[PDB]
Amino acid sequence: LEQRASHKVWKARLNAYQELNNLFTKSSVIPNDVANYWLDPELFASYIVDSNVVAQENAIIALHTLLEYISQVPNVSTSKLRLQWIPPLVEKGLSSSRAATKAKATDCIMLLTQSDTSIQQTVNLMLPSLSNKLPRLVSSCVKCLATIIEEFGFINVSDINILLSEILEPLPKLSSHADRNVRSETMNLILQIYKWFGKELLQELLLEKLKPIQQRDLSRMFEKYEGTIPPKQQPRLFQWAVPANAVDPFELLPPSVILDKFPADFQTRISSTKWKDRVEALEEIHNNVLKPVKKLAHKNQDYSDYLRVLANVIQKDANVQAVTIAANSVQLLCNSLRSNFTRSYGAIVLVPLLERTKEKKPSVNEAICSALDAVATYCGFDDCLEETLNYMKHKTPQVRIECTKFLTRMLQGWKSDGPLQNQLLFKLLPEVTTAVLKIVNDTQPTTRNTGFECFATLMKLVGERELADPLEKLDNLKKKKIYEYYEKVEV
Amino acid sequence: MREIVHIQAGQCGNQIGAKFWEVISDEHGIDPTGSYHGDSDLQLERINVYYNVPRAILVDLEPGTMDSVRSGPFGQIFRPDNFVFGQSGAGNNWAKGHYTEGAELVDSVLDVVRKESESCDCLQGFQLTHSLGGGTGSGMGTLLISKIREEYPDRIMNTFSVVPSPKVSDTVVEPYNATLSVHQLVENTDETYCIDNEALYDICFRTLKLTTPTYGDLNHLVSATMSGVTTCLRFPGQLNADLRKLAVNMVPFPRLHFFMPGFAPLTSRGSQQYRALTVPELTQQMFDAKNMMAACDPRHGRYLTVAAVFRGRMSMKEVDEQMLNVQNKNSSYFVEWIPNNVKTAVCDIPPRGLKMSATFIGNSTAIQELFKRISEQFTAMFRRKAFLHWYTGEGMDEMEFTEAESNMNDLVSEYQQYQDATAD
Amino acid sequence: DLGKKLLEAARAGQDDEVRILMANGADVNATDASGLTPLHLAATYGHLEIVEVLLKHGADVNAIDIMGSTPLHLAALIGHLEIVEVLLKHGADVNAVDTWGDTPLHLAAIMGHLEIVEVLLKHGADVNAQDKFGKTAFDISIDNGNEDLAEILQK
Amino acid sequence: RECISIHVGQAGVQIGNACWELYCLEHGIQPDGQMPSDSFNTFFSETGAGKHVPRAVFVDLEPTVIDEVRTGTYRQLFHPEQLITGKEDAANNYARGHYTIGKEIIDLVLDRIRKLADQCTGLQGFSVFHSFGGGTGSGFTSLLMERLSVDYGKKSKLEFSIYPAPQVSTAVVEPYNSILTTHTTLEHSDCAFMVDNEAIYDICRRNLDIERPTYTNLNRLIGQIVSSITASLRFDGALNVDLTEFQTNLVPYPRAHFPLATYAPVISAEQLSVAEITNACFEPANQMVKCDPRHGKYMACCLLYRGDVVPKDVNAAIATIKTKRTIQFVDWCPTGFKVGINYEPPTVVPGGDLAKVQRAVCMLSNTTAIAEAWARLDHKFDLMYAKRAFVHWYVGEGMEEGEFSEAREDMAALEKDYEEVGV
Ligand SMILES: Nc1nc2c(ncn2[C@@H]2O[C@H](COP(=O)(O)OP(=O)(O)OP(=O)(O)O)[C@@H](O)[C@H]2O)c(=O)[nH]1
Ligand SMILES: Nc1nc2c(ncn2[C@@H]2O[C@H](COP(=O)(O)OP(=O)(O)O)[C@@H](O)[C@H]2O)c(=O)[nH]1
Numbered sequence A: 001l002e003q004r005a006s007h008k009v010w011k012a013r014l015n016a017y018q019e020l021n022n023l024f025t026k027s028s029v030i031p032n033d034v035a036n037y038w039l040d041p042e043l044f045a046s047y048i049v050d051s052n053v054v055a056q057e058n059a060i061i062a063l064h065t066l067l068e069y070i071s072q073v074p075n076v077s078t079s080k081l082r083l084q085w086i087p088p089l090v091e092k093g094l095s096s097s098r099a100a101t102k103a104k105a106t107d108c109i110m111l112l113t114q115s116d117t118s119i120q121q122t123v124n125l126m127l128p129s130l131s132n133k134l135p136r137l138v139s140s141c142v143k144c145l146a147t148i149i150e151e152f153g154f155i156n157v158s159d160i161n162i163l164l165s166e167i168l169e170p171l172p173k174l175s176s177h178a179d180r181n182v183r184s185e186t187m188n189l190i191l192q193i194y195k196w197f198g199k200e201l202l203q204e205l206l207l208e209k210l211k212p213i214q215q216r217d218l219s220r221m222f223e224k225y226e227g228t229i230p231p232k233q234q235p236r237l238f239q240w241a242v243p244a245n246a247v248d249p250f251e252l253l254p255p256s257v258i259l260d261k262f263p264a265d266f267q268t269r270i271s272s273t274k275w276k277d278r279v280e281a282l283e284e285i286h287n288n289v290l291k292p293v294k295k296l297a298h299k300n301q302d303y304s305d306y307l308r309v310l311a312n313v314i315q316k317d318a319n320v321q322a323v324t325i326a327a328n329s330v331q332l333l334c335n336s337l338r339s340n341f342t343r344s345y346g347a348i349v350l351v352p353l354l355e356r357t358k359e360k361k362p363s364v365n366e367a368i369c370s371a372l373d374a375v376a377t378y379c380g381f382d383d384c385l386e387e388t389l390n391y392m393k394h395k396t397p398q399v400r401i402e403c404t405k406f407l408t409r410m411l412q413g414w415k416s417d418g419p420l421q422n423q424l425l426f427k428l429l430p431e432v433t434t435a436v437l438k439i440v441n442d443t444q445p446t447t448r449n450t451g452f453e454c455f456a457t458l459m460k461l462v463g464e465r466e467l468a469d470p471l472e473k474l475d476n477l478k479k480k481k482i483y484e485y486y487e488k489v490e491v
Numbered sequence B: 001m002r003e004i005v006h007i008q009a010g011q012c013g014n015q016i017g018a019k020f021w022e023v024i025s026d027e028h029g030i031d032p033t034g035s036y037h038g039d040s041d042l043q044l045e046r047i048n049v050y051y052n053v054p055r056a057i058l059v060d061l062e063p064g065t066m067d068s069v070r071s072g073p074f075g076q077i078f079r080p081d082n083f084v085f086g087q088s089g090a091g092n093n094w095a096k097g098h099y100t101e102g103a104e105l106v107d108s109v110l111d112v113v114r115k116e117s118e119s120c121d122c123l124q125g126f127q128l129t130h131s132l133g134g135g136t137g138s139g140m141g142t143l144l145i146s147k148i149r150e151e152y153p154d155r156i157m158n159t160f161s162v163v164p165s166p167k168v169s170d171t172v173v174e175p176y177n178a179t180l181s182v183h184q185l186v187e188n189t190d191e192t193y194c195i196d197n198e199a200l201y202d203i204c205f206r207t208l209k210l211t212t213p214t215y216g217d218l219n220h221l222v223s224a225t226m227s228g229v230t231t232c233l234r235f236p237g238q239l240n241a242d243l244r245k246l247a248v249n250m251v252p253f254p255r256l257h258f259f260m261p262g263f264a265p266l267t268s269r270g271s272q273q274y275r276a277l278t279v280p281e282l283t284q285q286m287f288d289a290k291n292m293m294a295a296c297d298p299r300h301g302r303y304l305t306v307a308a309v310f311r312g313r314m315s316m317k318e319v320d321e322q323m324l325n326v327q328n329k330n331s332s333y334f335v336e337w338i339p340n341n342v343k344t345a346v347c348d349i350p351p352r353g354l355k356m357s358a359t360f361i362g363n364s365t366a367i368q369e370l371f372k373r374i375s376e377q378f379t380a381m382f383r384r385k386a387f388l389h390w391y392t393g394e395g396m397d398e399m400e401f402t403e404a405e406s407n408m409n410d411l412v413s414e415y416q417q418y419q420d421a422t423a424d
Numbered sequence C: 001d002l003g004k005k006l007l008e009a010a011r012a013g014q015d016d017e018v019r020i021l022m023a024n025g026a027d028v029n030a031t032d033a034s035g036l037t038p039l040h041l042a043a044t045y046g047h048l049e050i051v052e053v054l055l056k057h058g059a060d061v062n063a064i065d066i067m068g069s070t071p072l073h074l075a076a077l078i079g080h081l082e083i084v085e086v087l088l089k090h091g092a093d094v095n096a097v098d099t100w101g102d103t104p105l106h107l108a109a110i111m112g113h114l115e116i117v118e119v120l121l122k123h124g125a126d127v128n129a130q131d132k133f134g135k136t137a138f139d140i141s142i143d144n145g146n147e148d149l150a151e152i153l154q155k
Numbered sequence D: 001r002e003c004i005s006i007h008v009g010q011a012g013v014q015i016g017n018a019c020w021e022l023y024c025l026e027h028g029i030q031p032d033g034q035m036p037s038d039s040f041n042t043f044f045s046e047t048g049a050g051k052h053v054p055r056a057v058f059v060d061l062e063p064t065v066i067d068e069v070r071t072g073t074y075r076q077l078f079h080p081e082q083l084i085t086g087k088e089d090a091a092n093n094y095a096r097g098h099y100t101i102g103k104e105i106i107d108l109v110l111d112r113i114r115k116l117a118d119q120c121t122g123l124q125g126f127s128v129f130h131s132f133g134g135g136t137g138s139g140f141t142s143l144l145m146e147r148l149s150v151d152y153g154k155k156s157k158l159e160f161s162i163y164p165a166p167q168v169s170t171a172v173v174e175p176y177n178s179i180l181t182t183h184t185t186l187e188h189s190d191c192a193f194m195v196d197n198e199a200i201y202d203i204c205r206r207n208l209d210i211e212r213p214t215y216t217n218l219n220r221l222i223g224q225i226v227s228s229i230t231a232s233l234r235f236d237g238a239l240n241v242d243l244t245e246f247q248t249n250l251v252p253y254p255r256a257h258f259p260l261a262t263y264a265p266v267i268s269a270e271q272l273s274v275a276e277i278t279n280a281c282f283e284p285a286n287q288m289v290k291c292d293p294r295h296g297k298y299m300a301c302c303l304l305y306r307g308d309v310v311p312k313d314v315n316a317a318i319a320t321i322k323t324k325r326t327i328q329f330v331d332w333c334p335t336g337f338k339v340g341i342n343y344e345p346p347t348v349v350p351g352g353d354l355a356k357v358q359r360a361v362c363m364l365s366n367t368t369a370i371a372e373a374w375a376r377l378d379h380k381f382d383l384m385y386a387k388r389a390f391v392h393w394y395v396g397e398g399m400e401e402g403e404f405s406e407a408r409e410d411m412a413a414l415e416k417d418y419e420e421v422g423v
């Protein structure tokens, strides 16, 4: 059906246009190489001039949704498109006698007009069609010219003078044209030029030459017009136009050095067999040495000897209390020493912390997770994105739900630019999604329910349309749970 | 679903634990040296469940208990490696068993648990015996359970937990310990047999007419109950065959998995009644609250599920009739919204010293009475804040007591809800 | 659904494949979206053998659809004289009314099926029957300049 | 021409044994596979060494039962690759059969089916034997049926379900498991013969004269009635000669594909007429599913006689019942009783409590009164699901709680589908 867009029988072409129109709704914003109806725009230029009125109209509504699927980045190739496309669109789409064939052709031109920086290049291409045999075409494409103006207008136009002359030139003949419609719809185009910089200018250039009855109707039309001589705000904006004092940090404060604080009876106390030795040792350097300070020394201070013994306990120490007071120490370092834990520090405690999410005691999960949040807010997503996934795949039920909740926490604070091709997208479908589904399809409900948020916090970040592929493979029953959180969840 | 790993923790744990191994070693025809001197294949048909030599791990912070087991009758059979014991004791401090001293040892225990599980064709789950008013059996046991729960989440956890009563020890911190332990069991075990010392004393004192029951006297009732409830597991049989199927047909709501066990006939230490009971007599030891190992009145609540195990040669026709009888003649006591909630199974090999016997495992909402008693004693103690510095000193937070208090009360409320529920 | 295949056949007119589908126990009075049985469809498109096949297998000769159309309506509309007499012989409703108030006599008169008009009349058609707008079969001949039909309606 | 049999859970496996025991006696096939003696090769294949192997797969998530197959009388009959076992059973939980445990073995099972289908040239479809209340029987079957509708989608599949009965019931949650499989297996089954274990119990207590029947008692009786239905496929009769014809004759609505089977005569081993046995087909006491067809409309009705039968006696006994009883039919039915005869005598097992009878009959009739059986399950289901009882077991093994409701609605919709046909 791909190459059948040019098949001989009409009803097989009619398919390909519907197939395409689906493709441009249902395919990727970033976009498949299969979406190559940009770098050969001769294709759709052909399709718009289909030798069959029914399969033509279906090609135009495929072009239409294509031509709005392309309001995603980067498609600076809209210059080539207007050249290739609007002459076929004007010549035989606006021309059409068919209600819907015409309406969508105009809408298409609209979307090509706002692809552009201004209106001139589109205007300049569809001007010649005013001089065509068929009246209903000049009847129509003067209406289309007049409403690319009333909704956009002249802005970011290099040489407006040259453009005004070029569109004012035919207006005498158009207003003396035989067809009633060509005339009636030319007075509208006059008004839409007056509506923007009339009437002193138009009476010097064009009012003089028209039938007296005509310039009366134009004046009657200007009274009924209310609103400032140039319109204050345009009813429609272009591409770039639509998107269209620093704050201080308290971190400037002097640093404090804690190496000098430590006691001689520390190393044997933390590496002791008596639990209370270890606890007191940790608890002292925490309450006496870390908790007071508010900024540690960035310059020339190696904590990766101290931090690797916090890990040794957080991972392996059998005393849940000594874990709790250690992960709170780890957090204090990551908090009072922002921008330190680049790799060696962050990575020295990361995989131990993820192992110990196994702990279910509320106070301990509080401390471990909050420390994981510290290492994340100053190293996200350096090592954690990968290793967090690893431990979602882990056998302990608790580490699954907690490390997945971790990805959820991190994903809500995912604000890294950009704007595209970040570490999240490089591994999105390959790893993140394949691993989040393993949570979504877990044996336990409380596990599954964490996946349901962690998938609805994912869609929120990366478009509920991009992930509609594995959404389909999922149960209709799990789907409405996922959607439940999508409606509540924020980043 | 074949092998079961057994654990015993604390003094009580190893006492009723060893007693259990004494009973079912005889029943299966194993001597203290570990050799088969039976005379039937129905004895070695499912010997692989509890034996390899027992698949039993012995645990206590109190090192003395080591010797009290090995110097016992079947003390020689247990694997020397499977003894894991600490230097000091917990001294009735749940926090010492759960957070400080008991936590230091728990790794060594898990190493042995792993070892025994490693060489299992297909593990079923685990089986822990312990007391709840202690420090080790409760604090370290519940910590062991959670530690297994997370290392073996694809397996069943089945406990024989004995409840403290003033009638057996006047230690007033036991309400604390048992409350904290119940806060664990409701979250960490699939099924728990509630052995109430209150009820064991009341049976030895009032029914067996022993003026001063010893532990041995109370332990006799326990070991006989355990062999009874594990009869399905240890011999060939269609119904309630493995641990998971049992729990599936016994536990309708995950938190309400506290069974009120009871069995018949009640005998003394080595006495014989010289007259074997009839099938209708055995059946009429179900509602008979003087046969419940938990101090609760089944009349004061409703049965959610019931498992009956008849042991001995008898009429399967008559047992069916009597059970079908006793259900509908007391129809208001069995929950209506669970149809066919009572299940009966027969084993031809009777227990030691009896021609016939019958064990009555029941998930009765009346069990809330038991948790009421524990909570009121806990609250009376906790409102005056007595002995809290013991627990808090070991790293515990005062908040924990409030949570365990509240969580047990939610457990009581839940039982009360389903008792007052209607099918309509 | 076997009732939907029997509609596809009875409409498009595959006489043989009706027997196949009916030998598989297809619903002779199976309704489509708008309540049209296969007898409706065969009587619309002039498949005489399919009408007689369905009727003798117990097709509702006087079945209506969502708009009150009997098969005799549709046969008299399209002008299938062979089928009209088959339906009437199988107890068809000569003075059936549909949602617009028309009888089969209205439709055969509007479409100029003079031969069918006379058959319906002789089976006791209501010549004075009125539609929604209030017009008889005789009023239609007056309104539509058909003096050949006016004479055939007063016979 | 070939048909493949599949046996899931203890129920399927142990009824399978009884059926293939009885098939081999009816076909003079030996326990070792030999034969001192085609239509019967619909069910059996052939070795180069003159050995006749069943076209069968045995599946259980647990050795014990299938272990007894391959250390028993008929251990030599099956190829060992046909007998498939796991280790952890489903524990009376549809979730474990369908989701947690079933996914670990489904691919091995589907693979071993391909090996039997590759030996076959013109494969017809599948016969499937399984319990309702069992975890394996419910969960794994419904999974296997889903996957067979993919890998063999364009062909038939027939069920032989064991409807649960408190007299032999092993689980409380058997209503749950029944509803859950019947929901997910509804779209994937072309026809399905239910067997109420209560009726089979009742029959064995009354007509076989047994106080407390065993599973052997029930399975033997069941295997006799299964043989009566598959006799047309194994001996090349006139009626029901291939698997499609079961749907043609008995299924006039895809969903309502649950025939009532009635079998006479069941004579203790401690002769009747053609007319007497045909009257017993309209006696509820001899049905396989406990209901009252008098309270329902017949959509179809077949009579499968076998033995010393005169075709004229049949037409007399038919006219007797069509005149002297009021068997109500639906108006959109042929209302004519279809018949077929197979002159070979009903084989029993040497030693069986069931006696050799001269002639026998098995009436297959898609009556709307079988809705009564669905109502009994649905009610038990409702009581427990009203309190969400035992639901945590299922939800904790990979199942969404919603699936309970979606299944219940599909059972409520099926009860309406039975009602509208019969009014
Ligand atoms: N008639 C008959 N019923 C049986 C037989 N075996 C089991 N059943 C019934 O089937 C139901 C479920 O039991 P099973 O089929 O053994 O369960 P399963 O399929 O093995 O599934 P799991 O054991 O849970 O893994 C019970 O209600 C039994 O009464 C049998 O051999 N014959
Ligand atoms: N039935 C029974 N209960 C006991 C036994 N020993 C102690 N208990 C009870 O258990 C509680 C004391 O806990 P214990 O097991 O001795 O402490 P532990 O060694 O730290 O676990 C009290 O409620 C005692 O009544 C025994 O042998 N049998």
Ligand SMILES: [Mg+2]
Pocket: B010, B011, B012, B060, B061, B062, B065, B089, B136
């Ligand atoms: Mg001790």
Ligand SMILES: [Mg+2]
Pocket: D009, D010, D060, D062, D089, D134, D136
């Ligand atoms: Mg089984």
